[PDB]
Structure formats: structure tokens, C-alpha cells
Amino acid sequence: QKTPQIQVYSRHPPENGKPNILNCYVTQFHPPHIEIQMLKNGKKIPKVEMSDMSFSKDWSFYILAHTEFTPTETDTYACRVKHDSMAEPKTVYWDRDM
Amino acid sequence: PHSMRYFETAVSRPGEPRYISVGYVDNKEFVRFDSDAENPRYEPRAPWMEQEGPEYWERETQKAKGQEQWFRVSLRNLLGYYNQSAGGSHTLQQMSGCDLGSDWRLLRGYLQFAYEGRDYIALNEDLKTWTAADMAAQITRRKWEQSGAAEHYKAYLEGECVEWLHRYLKNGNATLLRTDSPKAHVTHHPRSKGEVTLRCWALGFYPADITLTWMELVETRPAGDGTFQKWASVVVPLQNYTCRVYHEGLPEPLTLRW
Amino acid sequence: ASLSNGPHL
């Protein structure tokens, strides 16, 4: 059992009001079964695109979750990850500066 | 420098195992097989891969159906070795492929297996001998020395692997050889103590290989459009530090400041 | 072009 590493980030540099793509890149986990949600303001975004399962040369699995989004100064965004290695779901919020 | 890789996974269900095979050419996904699909088939994952005819896909599909069955029987053998029972949830993985030099000749061939996410058995660089990771894999090792399994993989790795990688590299020059340079900028985030976090961004570059120097350094991430992202950061007082970006698509390595 | 394994584990 390996703990997932998460990165939440945008495809393009973010500008308020401009449509963009928000990515959740989950990495370094095992077993392959995992559950990923993406939240706007704390509520689940309905149409979340999942990439197909892959793994790296170190055997660990990785996956990209992504959604359409138009960021604003008020709205927050997050990725919720559920995995056998973690007691509780880990949520990591989007930081424009990272 | 070039490479072809096939990454295979078979995972057991509680109470038929799912089999997934993913092919790579120079670290870009180009073919994929999934047993969970409505009609299991190798599918093109690159636009230049649509060159190949219906006989190619059928031939590759059938070979995937053989691997799936190979992975089932091996899963059953593993249960016997590690003294587990049927049937829980288990993972068997394999990596295979060939590295090519710029002269298009064989540099290295790979063949390695993993059970439950950790090393099981690997073929050595010589393509003749086996290294077993633990006691159970030793049974496999001695079984494969007697039956000379090493020679079969050696033939693939020096033959089909190399000769088809050549064909794939021909068919996709406009995308596999193509480059996208990192557009780099530097951001400024004041912090506690009189310190500032200078953060050098590299965005929209292909291929993924890159080096950032000036120390927090996040792992390279996909942008989702085909290109890649990465950043490096240092803690600086009140700005004579320079970020250096090294990438294949860059005529000169970029040097930038805040 | 994918590989076809020989002897099982």
C-alpha cells in the first residue's frame, strides 16, 4: 500500500473570468483502485473527466482528473482522493501560486 | 535517443482479472488495450498511429488476449508460491521494451515483473540471466533457466522491438521528433522573516524531460493538452539569483530573474 | 508491436 501524491493546478496561467482547465494529478499510489472527486466551493463537480490508468517505471500508478472551470476571486477549488492507504479522504485546495 | 515500452497490469477481482496493456514510443502513449471494454481491442492513442490497417490491430488484439491468459495462469502460480488462497485482490505488472541510440542500434532491452507493487523478477542487461527479488521468484528463476525463457525475450528485444520501433518513428516524425519550448516566467511571493519565495515556472513544453536550477522542486505534471509543467523555488531575502531552464527545444538555455 | 510471454511464472 502506497500513499497517493496530489497536485492541483491549471492547464494555463489563471485569469479571473477566463475559461481554463483544472487538473488533479494523482501519483505514487498502490493498489490501483482509487476514488477521485473535484469540488467547487465544497460541492462535487458533476462531469469530471478521468484519464485511463497507467503506471511509472517504479511500479506505482498514476491518473489525471480534469474539469472545465472559470476561476473567480471568490470561488475555491479542490480535489478529494479516497484510497486504501489513507484513513480519511485527503483534500487539497487549488493554489494559484503553485 | 529513442525507446519503445509496453506496460502491462493484471488485477484480480474478489470472487475474472482485468488486464490493461499500454504502449509507449519515446514516453508518449500510442496504443492501449483494456479488457473491461465492451469490445476489447488495441486502440490508437496517437493520431499518427491511425496509419496502420485492420490486420495490424487484430494481430495485436489477439496477442493481448494471449497475455491476459498468461497473466491469469501466473496469478494462480503466485498464490501457490506465497501461500495465499483464491481469490482476493492482487496485482501483477510487467515492463518490457528496448532503448535505441541515435545510430538506431540496440542500447538496452528490458523485461521485469512485479507482484503486489514490488519487484519480482527481472531480466539482466545481458539478456541471458535472471535476478529474483525474493524467495518465491527463485522458483520462477530456476524454472526459466531450465526451459530457457531468456532466449525468447532476447529475440523479441533484439528483433521485433527494434524493427517496429523504427517503423513507428518513421510514421510519426511530425510529432515524436517535434518540440515545444518552455515559456518561462518567475513569480514573487513575500513570506515570514523578510524572506521571499522566488518561483521559476516552465510551462507548455514537450517532451517532459527538463532541468530547473537556481530548493522545492515539484514532480513534472501533464498540462492535459499534450504539454508538460514544472516549477522550482528558493527562499531569498530582499534578488541576484537566476533561474536556469535546460530543455531540448531550446536553442540556448534560458536564464531569467525576478 | 507487443510481446508474447513464454513460460509462466
Explain what you see.
Chain C: This is Spike protein S1. Chain C: Attaches the virion to the cell membrane by interacting with host receptor, initiating the infection. Chain B: Residues 182-257 form the Ig-like C1-type domain. Chain B: Residues 180-258 are annotated as: Alpha-3. With 98 residues, chain A is an all-beta fold. Chain A has one domain (1-98): Sandwich (Immunoglobulin-like). Chain A is built from no helices and 9 strands. Chain A starts with a strand and ends in a 5-residue tail after the last strand. Chain B folds into 2 domains: 1-178, MHC class I-like antigen recognition-like (Murine Class I Major Histocompatibility Complex, H2-DB, Chain A, domain 1); 179-258, Immunoglobulins (Immunoglobulin-like). Chain B has helices at 54-81, 135-146, 149-158, 160-171, 173-177, and strands at 2-11, 18-25, 28-34, 43-44, 91-100, 106-115, 118-123, 130-132, 183-190, 196-205, 211-213, 216-217, 221-222, 228-236, 243-246, 254-256. The longest helix of chain B has 28 residues, at 54-81. The relative contact order of chain B is 0.11. Chain C contains no helices and no strands. Chain C is rod-shaped. Chain A binds chain B through residues 2, 5, 7, 9, 11-13, 21, 23, 25, 27, 30-33, 52-55, 57, 59-60, 64, 66, 97-98, and chain B through 7, 9, 11, 20, 22, 29, 32, 34, 89, 91, 93, 95, 114, 117-119, 187, 189, 199, 203, 218-219, 221-225, 229, 231.
Topology summary:
The complex is a heterotrimer of chains A (98), B (258) and C (9).
Chain A: E1 5-10, E2 20-29, E3 35-40, E4 43-44, E5 49-50, E6 54-55, E7 61-69, E8 77-82, E9 90-93
Antiparallel strand pairs in A: 1-2, 2-7, 3-4, 3-8, 5-7, 6-7, 8-9
Chain B: E1 2-11, E2 18-25, E3 28-34, E4 43-44, H1 54-81, E5 91-100, E6 106-115, E7 118-123, E8 130-132, H2 135-146, H3 149-158, H4 160-171, H5 173-177, E9 183-190, E10 196-205, E11 211-213, E12 216-217, E13 221-222, E14 228-236, E15 243-246, E16 254-256
Helix pairs in contact in B: 3-4
Chain C: no helix or strand
